[PDB]
Amino acid sequence: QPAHLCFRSFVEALKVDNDLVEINTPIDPNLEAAAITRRVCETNDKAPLFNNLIGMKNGLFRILGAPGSLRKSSADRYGRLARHLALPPTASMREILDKMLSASDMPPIPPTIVPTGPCKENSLDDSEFDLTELPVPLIHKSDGGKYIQTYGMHIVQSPDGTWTNWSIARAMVHDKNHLTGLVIPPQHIWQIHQMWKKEGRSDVPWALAFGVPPAAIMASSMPIPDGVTEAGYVGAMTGSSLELVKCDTNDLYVPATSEIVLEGTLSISETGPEGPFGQMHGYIFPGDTHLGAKYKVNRITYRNNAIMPMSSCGRLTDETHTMIGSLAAAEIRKLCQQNDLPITDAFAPFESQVTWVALRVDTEKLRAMKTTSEGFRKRVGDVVFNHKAGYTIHRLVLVGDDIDVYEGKDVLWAFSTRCRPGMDETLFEDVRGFPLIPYMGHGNGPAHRGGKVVSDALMPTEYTTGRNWEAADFNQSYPEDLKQKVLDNWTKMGFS
Amino acid sequence: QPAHLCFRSFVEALKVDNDLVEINTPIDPNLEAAAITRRVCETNDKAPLFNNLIGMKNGLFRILGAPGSLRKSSADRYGRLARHLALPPTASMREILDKMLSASDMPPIPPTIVPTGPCKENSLDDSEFDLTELPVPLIHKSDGGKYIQTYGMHIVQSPDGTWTNWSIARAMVHDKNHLTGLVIPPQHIWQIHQMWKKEGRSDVPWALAFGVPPAAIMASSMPIPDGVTEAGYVGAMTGSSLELVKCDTNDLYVPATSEIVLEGTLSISETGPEGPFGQMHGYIFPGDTHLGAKYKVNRITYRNNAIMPMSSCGRLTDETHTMIGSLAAAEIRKLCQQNDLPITDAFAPFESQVTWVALRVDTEKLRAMKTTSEGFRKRVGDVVFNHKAGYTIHRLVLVGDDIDVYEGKDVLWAFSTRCRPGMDETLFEDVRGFPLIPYMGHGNGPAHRGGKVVSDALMPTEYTTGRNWEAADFNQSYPEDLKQKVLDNWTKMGFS
Ligand SMILES: Cc1cc2c3c(c1C)C(C)(C)CC=[N+]3c1c([nH]c(=O)[nH]c1=O)N2C[C@H](O)[C@H](O)[C@H](O)COP(=O)(O)O
Ligand SMILES: Cc1cc2c3c(c1C)C(C)(C)CC=[N+]3c1c([nH]c(=O)[nH]c1=O)N2C[C@H](O)[C@H](O)[C@H](O)COP(=O)(O)O
Ligand SMILES: [K+]
Ligand SMILES: [K+]
Ligand SMILES: [K+]
Ligand SMILES: [K+]
Ligand SMILES: [Mn+2]
Numbered sequence: 002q003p004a005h006l007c008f009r010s011f012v013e014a015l016k017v018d019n020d021l022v023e024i025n026t027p028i029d030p031n032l033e034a035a036a037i038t039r040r041v042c043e044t045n046d047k048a049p050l051f052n053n054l055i056g057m058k059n060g061l062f063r064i065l066g067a068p069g070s071l072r073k074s075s076a077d078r079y080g081r082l083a084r085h086l087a088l089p090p091t092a093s094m095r096e097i098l099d100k101m102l103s104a105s106d107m108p109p110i111p112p113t114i115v116p117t118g119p120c121k122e123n124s125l126d127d128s129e130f131d132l133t134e135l136p137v138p139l140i141h142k143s144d145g146g147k148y149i150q151t152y153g154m155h156i157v158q159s160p161d162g163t164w165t166n167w168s169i170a171r172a173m174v175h176d177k178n179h180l181t182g183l184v185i186p187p188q189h190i191w192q193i194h195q196m197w198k199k200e201g202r203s204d205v206p207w208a209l210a211f212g213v214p215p216a217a218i219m220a221s222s223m224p225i226p227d228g229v230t231e232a233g234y235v236g237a238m239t240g241s242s243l244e245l246v247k248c249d250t251n252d253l254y255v256p257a258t259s260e261i262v263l264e265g266t267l268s269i270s271e272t273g274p275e276g277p278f279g280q281m282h283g284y285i286f287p288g289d290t291h292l293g294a295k296y297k298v299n300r301i302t303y304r305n306n307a308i309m310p311m312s313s314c315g316r317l318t319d320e321t322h323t324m325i326g327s328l329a330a331a332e333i334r335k336l337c338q339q340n341d342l343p344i345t346d347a348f349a350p351f352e353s354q355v356t357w358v359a360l361r362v363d364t365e366k367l368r369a370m371k372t373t374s375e376g377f378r379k380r381v382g383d384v385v386f387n388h389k390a391g392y393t394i395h396r397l398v399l400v401g402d403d404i405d406v407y408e409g410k411d412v413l414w415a416f417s418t419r420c421r422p423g424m425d426e427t428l429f430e431d432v433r434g435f436p437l438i439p440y441m442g443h444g445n446g447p448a449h450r451g452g453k454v455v456s457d458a459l460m461p462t463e464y465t466t467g468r469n470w471e472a473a474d475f476n477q478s479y480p481e482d483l484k485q486k487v488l489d490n491w492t493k494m495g496f497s
Numbered sequence: 498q499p500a501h502l503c504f505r506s507f508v509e510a511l512k513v514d515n516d517l518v519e520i521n522t523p524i525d526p527n528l529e530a531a532a533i534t535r536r537v538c539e540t541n542d543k544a545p546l547f548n549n550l551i552g553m554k555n556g557l558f559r560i561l562g563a564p565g566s567l568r569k570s571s572a573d574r575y576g577r578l579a580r581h582l583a584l585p586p587t588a589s590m591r592e593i594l595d596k597m598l599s600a601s602d603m604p605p606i607p608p609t610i611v612p613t614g615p616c617k618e619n620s621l622d623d624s625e626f627d628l629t630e631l632p633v634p635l636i637h638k639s640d641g642g643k644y645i646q647t648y649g650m651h652i653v654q655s656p657d658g659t660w661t662n663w664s665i666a667r668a669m670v671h672d673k674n675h676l677t678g679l680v681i682p683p684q685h686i687w688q689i690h691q692m693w694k695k696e697g698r699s700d701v702p703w704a705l706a707f708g709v710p711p712a713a714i715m716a717s718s719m720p721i722p723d724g725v726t727e728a729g730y731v732g733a734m735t736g737s738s739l740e741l742v743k744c745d746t747n748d749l750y751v752p753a754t755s756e757i758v759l760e761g762t763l764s765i766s767e768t769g770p771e772g773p774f775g776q777m778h779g780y781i782f783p784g785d786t787h788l789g790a791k792y793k794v795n796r797i798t799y800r801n802n803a804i805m806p807m808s809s810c811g812r813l814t815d816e817t818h819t820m821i822g823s824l825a826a827a828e829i830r831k832l833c834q835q836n837d838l839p840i841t842d843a844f845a846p847f848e849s850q851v852t853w854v855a856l857r858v859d860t861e862k863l864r865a866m867k868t869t870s871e872g873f874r875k876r877v878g879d880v881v882f883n884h885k886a887g888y889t890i891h892r893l894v895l896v897g898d899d900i901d902v903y904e905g906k907d908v909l910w911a912f913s914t915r916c917r918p919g920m921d922e923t924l925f926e927d928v929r930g931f932p933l934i935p936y937m938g939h940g941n942g943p944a945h946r947g948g949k950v951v952s953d954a955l956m957p958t959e960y961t962t963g964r965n966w967e968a969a970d971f972n973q974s975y976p977e978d979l980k981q982k983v984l985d986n987w988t989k990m991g992f993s
């Protein structure tokens with residue numbers, strides 16, 4: 002099976018790329034595996050595969066850390082991500098996000114049911130497992146639990162059967178047969194939970210699949226529209242129907258080659274302690290436990306030699322930056338274009354801890370609108386900040402065509418030099434806020450509302466007659482023939 | 498003579514450091530010298546010494562580009578700057594700025610007059626030179642003139658003789674015996690000019706010295722207080738009285754080892770076209786010429802084999818970032834401490850195009866103030882933004898003790914995660930603005946007023962009971978003994 006369609010094959014691909022380190026000596030799931038992975042993410046090193054976990058048994062489990070993190074070279078920086086999607090390892094971010102958006106203008110390709118797959122090679126019923134005995138990692142020293150779920154996909158379906166959602170949301174072990182986790186608005190797992198809670202008759206049938214097809218975990222991390230079944234989006238994206246097998250204890254369907262599958266229920270009534278957790282913005286507040294959603298686990302199925310992927314998330318750079326930020330930016334680009342806004346590109350700068358999105362504007366199109374900064378900021382912010390795709394994003398930065406939004410140095414340069422504080426900005430207090438950002442949930446104002454801004458880094462003439470400056474840089478302040486002469490004589494002269 | 502006291506010796510030091518490239522083949526002052534220098538600054542390469550300028554004659558002049566720019570290695574990043582100050586080349590930015598501040602609590606050491614020096618080796622009277630025939634560079638393709646003055650020191654004295662100021666301000670050739678340049682409030686050259694203009698009797702006696710003692714050009718770039726003679730500050734800083742020789746045509750005094758000296762007058766009545774110029778924020782607006790101050794040149798004196806230093810300024814990183822930003826930050830640190838504010842460190846992040854200063858707060862001291870964000874922002878912004886030291890700075894970012902303000906990644910992380918837009922900020926519209934920033938002089942509002950902000954990236958408990966988080970990073974989220982084990986086994990395991 003190809004890498005993008007089978008996690009086991011993806012691990013192979015990473016080896017074969019010289020993008021993996023296999024670690025066959027014992028590694029402790031209590032902090033050591035995550036510490037090594039954290040170091041990898043902070044240095045853009047090779048992904049670690051821990052083949053010898055302490056306390057590995059019933060054959061559960063090996064760990065792959067840093068599955069969606071960065072490579073060291075500029076040329077294949079995003080190669081791990083490219084390998085989720087059948088793209089060349091030199092793919093740019095534009096090409097990755099275009100791939101992720103491509104299915105938004107295609108018919109879904111619904112999944113194919115098959116009778117069995119590798120995820121059925123082993124099973125443990127509810128007298129045979131104990132989640133507290135498995136080698137579940139402690140990821141950060143102050144975490145409030147062992148976070149089994151950092152890179153699996155939750156599967157829940159609307160009561161009417163018409164929407165099956167796949168998404169990533171964190172969860173930790175509560176006791177031998179339960180998890181607790183985040184289930185928060187406006188996320189689709191929360192929207193579906195609310196439908197079951199309003200019907201009032203039963204807990205939500207649920208599955209959590211770990212080590213799913215890479216192309217599926219990428220869609221699981223993307224805010225595709227309400228009501229859209231990720232399986233059919235991924236089918237369209239990849240050009241192929243995904244093969245799914247039915248759960249044994251419910252009627253949900255899981256990828257056939259899933260490494261590990263939990264089957265059970267998400268309660269419509271019960272909660273339990275959840276968190277704290279070292280999170281995407283780089284923080285943990287020790288002791289900050291709150292009531293989260295509760296999950297019952299009835300059955301585990303798994304591949305021979307199962308591998309659990311793990312995100313050791315926090316400070317730059319990991320899956321919470323490369324996937325959450327970039328995939329939200331992608332969806333925001335599309336949303337703006339569908340609202341008739343002249344946005345060509347969007348990206349969440351890593352330097353902003355993926356709390357900003359830079360929007361590149363087609364300024365010929367903007368000029369034809371015959372508008373102003375105040376009006377345009379206002380229009381962009383209403384579209385984005387009132388939509389789920391904008392949930393995680395607190396600052397939008399509008400930039401003209403000269404800026405490469407995929408280059409954070411250029412975004413920072415534009416923001417710092419073209420946006421006058423206050424006057425060139427519009428604050429939005431009456432929109433949903435992302436409480437996970439420290440300045441929101443641990444800050445001076447409402448945790449769930451406001452704190453958003455549109456910062457216009459378009460210069461005045463970009464709305465009227467066109468750009469009226471040149472950069473004071475090598476590229477723009479010298480003619481072509483001089484530039485080339487300099488470059489041709491560079492090493493001759495003594496330079497590197 | 499030591500490097501910090503004699504520019505010729507500084508050039509030697511750079512060679513000897515393997516921090517110079519000598520270029521002995523002909524180089525055109527029309528754009529080529531500046532293009533090579535621009536490339537150096539954008540790549541942190543070795544400083545270029547152009548020993549064979551096209552149109553070099555009456556022995557005027559060689560050029561040294563990038564005199565205060567960055568080196569490639571992290572370990573001696575600031576080494577060129579250290580070599581201005583007798584500091585080791587591995588000096589940190591803290592150590593450089595402390596050196597620059599050290600004289601603020603010392604008696605001045607006034608300069609010593611000597612009868613002659615190297616700057617008298619050659620002379621041209623006002624029938625012998627022509628500024629349009631010298632190899633003055635065109636620095637950026639769209640500049641409005643050939644900017645002779647990018648790294649020399651203007652010397653002007655108050656009418657009463659009690660204050661002699663040394664400062665860098667740009668100037669370009671107007672005609673055979675005149676320059677035009679920036680002379681703008683609140684700068685000291687402007688304050689002194691105003692005193693002469695109010696007296697109304699004569700033009701300002703003036704000299705412009707190029708290739709001055711390195712320690713002197715650093716003080717020339719720093720906003721030391723009103724009324725303080727830079728020569729005596731530099732004397733105190735260096736522990737030695739500077740040797741000065743009298744001008745031939747006026748009673749000003751110039752460093753004895755100056756490479757090139759212009760003597761003349763700064764008009765109290767006449768102006769001439771000035772600019773545009775590719776500037777510190779990275780821009781040029783072609784065609785944007787305005788009336789600037791006018792200077793008459795009566796005499797040139799110069800060293801044998803004179804060397805003109807040149808800043809090819811623009812996008813990161815050059816003297817306008819390393820010196821303007823950092824030296825303003827230094828003075829702001831001191832100003833805050835003298836106003837009883839608990840600021841330990843200040844730096845202007847390069848990533849902000851030196852338009853921000855990050856202020857590190859001693860949060861034990863802040864807690865004892867028993868104050869709030871609104872009040873503290875307000876107090877900091879009034880102190881800084883109403884003072885000349887704050888002129889160039891439009892955003893102050895307050896951070897707690899865990900942040901290294903000399904590390905722009907950490908400043909950005911703190912700003913993006915700890916400062917809620919709007920609520921955690923105070924805008925300042927009724928303060929002097931820096932018109933050179935594009936969003937000011939070419940923006941939507943008043944060019945000279947407002948556009949400033951204090952952004953509080955202190956978290957709430959930093960005002961009350963103390964920091965309540967740990968970072969989700971390798972350093973903070975894992976115990977010491979684990980961290981060391983990981984590091985000790987890193988290359989063993991397969992990592993770099
Ligand atoms: C890549 C990724 C995405 C996480 C995520 C993580 C990763 C690695 C973790 C597990 C390491 C840390 C926490 N995560 C959560 C999360 N969304 C959320 O609601 N709760 C979370 O706990 N997300 C974001 C979420 O997957 C996206 O917002 C999706 O758009 C949700 O899918 P949906 O649009 O179908 O609701
Ligand atoms: C290092 C440096 C500093 C420049 C400077 C440049 C460099 C290389 C140039 C020449 C390349 C570009 C323009 N510069 C100007 C300038 N200040 C100003 O008033 N006009 C300028 O044209 N400065 C900043 C100025 O030197 C500081 O604000 C000093 O504090 C001024 O001294 P003062 O406090 O005695 O007035
Ligand atoms: K999803
Ligand atoms: K603007
Ligand atoms: K000065
Ligand atoms: K704050
Ligand atoms: Mn969804």
Ligand SMILES: [Mn+2]
Nearest residue numbers: 662663685721
């Ligand atoms: Mn001064």
